[PDB]
Each structure stands twice: as C-alpha cells, then as structure tokens.
C-alpha cells in the first residue's frame, strides 16, 4: 500500500511539504459517498454530482502541484548555494569536508527522492481517479501538468549531484 510506503520514506522534516496522499483517497472515497444513484435521482442530477466533484478534485490537485513546485524549487536554490560555498571551502584551504561534502551529497538524494515519492504519489492517485470515475481526465491531467512541472522535469538537482561527484571524486 502506497500510503504506507509514503508515510515510511517521508523526510520527517519535511512531512507537510509532500502530496497529501491520504488526504486524497479520503476525497475520492467521499465522492463515492455523497453519489446519488440514477434510479433514486436522474441522469443530469448524477453527471452534475460529478462535475462538480471533478472540479473540487482537480483544483485540489492543482494545489498541491504548487506546493511541492514551489517546496522543491526552494530546496534547490538552497542546494545551489550550498554547492557554491562548500566550493570555496575546498577553492581555497584544499577530513571536515569529507564529511561535510557527503553530507550536502546525502541532502540532494533525499531531495530527489522527494521528487519521485511525489511523482509516484501524483501517479497512482490519478490512475486511482481515473478507475473509480471511469474517465481517463486524471491521466490527461498528469500528462498536461504533472509531467511537465519543474519539481519532475528539472535536471539542475542531477547537474548538482553529477558536479558533486566530480569534486569528491578528483579533489
């Protein structure tokens, strides 16, 4: 189960800053809660029932997409300017950096897997979606939005780690 999975190899410290996973499924579990059925009601009463519903989720997920986009765009400017000043460090005095580079290297994976954590997350709930409301919306929706965020296109974390790697290695 996934949101096991997610909640083991969640950064504690960044806990809030992942996809709300649980949150999600809760939503898609109310969809189905609140849906009146189309003998008891009618057909526009239960495709607007819906709408409406498919509206609140995608806005949701839009939300959340800004969220992890703007976290993960934080951490890596954060990451630049760590680079840049652990560049120095060695640019000039040439067992304390040994460390602390492995230290800034270990602070870039645990960011790149708060990429692919969120990813997958973003991936299952909108094939999730998709099933439950017999639709392919939510595919479309990862297609047109999710694969095309910079917290999941954005390659200057592996430039990062590939520099970091150079340094540690040469120097």
Known sequence: ???????????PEWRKQ?????AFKDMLYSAQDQAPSVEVTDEDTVKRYFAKFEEKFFQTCEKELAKINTFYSEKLA?????FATLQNELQSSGGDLKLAFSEFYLSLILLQNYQN???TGFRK????????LETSRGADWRVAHVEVAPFYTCKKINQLISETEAVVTNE
């Open 78 to 82: 954060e990451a630049q300017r760590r």
């Open 117 to 119: 954590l969120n990813f």
């Open 18 to 22: 992942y996809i709300q996973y649980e």
């Open 1 to 11: 189960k996934f949101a096991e999975h997610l909640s083991a190899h969640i950064t």
């Open 125 to 132: 709930i909108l094939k999730k979606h998709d099933k439950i």
